[PDB]
From a paper:
It catalyzes di- and tri-methylation of lysine 9 of histone H3, which are related to chromatin packaging and gene silencing. Although the SET domain performs the catalytic activity, the chromodomain of SUV39H1 is vital for the catalytic activity of SUV39H1.
The β-barrel consists of a sheet with three antiparalled strands β1 (residues 45–53), β2 (residues 58–64) and β3 (residues 73–76). Interestingly, the chromodomain of the human SUV39H1 we crystallized lacks the first aromatic residue F43 of the aromatic cage. By means of fluorescence polarization assay, we found that the partial chromodomain does not show detectable binding to any histone H3K9 peptides.
Author numbering: 43 to 104
The structure:
Amino acid sequence: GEVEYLCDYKKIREQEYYLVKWRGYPDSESTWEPRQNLKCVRILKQFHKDLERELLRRHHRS
């Protein structure tokens, strides 16, 4: 299975999950996958940096 891109992130409650858009599936077929299922470290880093910037934007608002 190859991750094309990550769509979202959640943590319940110790366990982290990622909404994964799979290569060869349409966008609406993305599925939630626990961190250990995934090998795509570059994509994870880019995803996290992107989200970090958005939370920082929000932190500054306050």
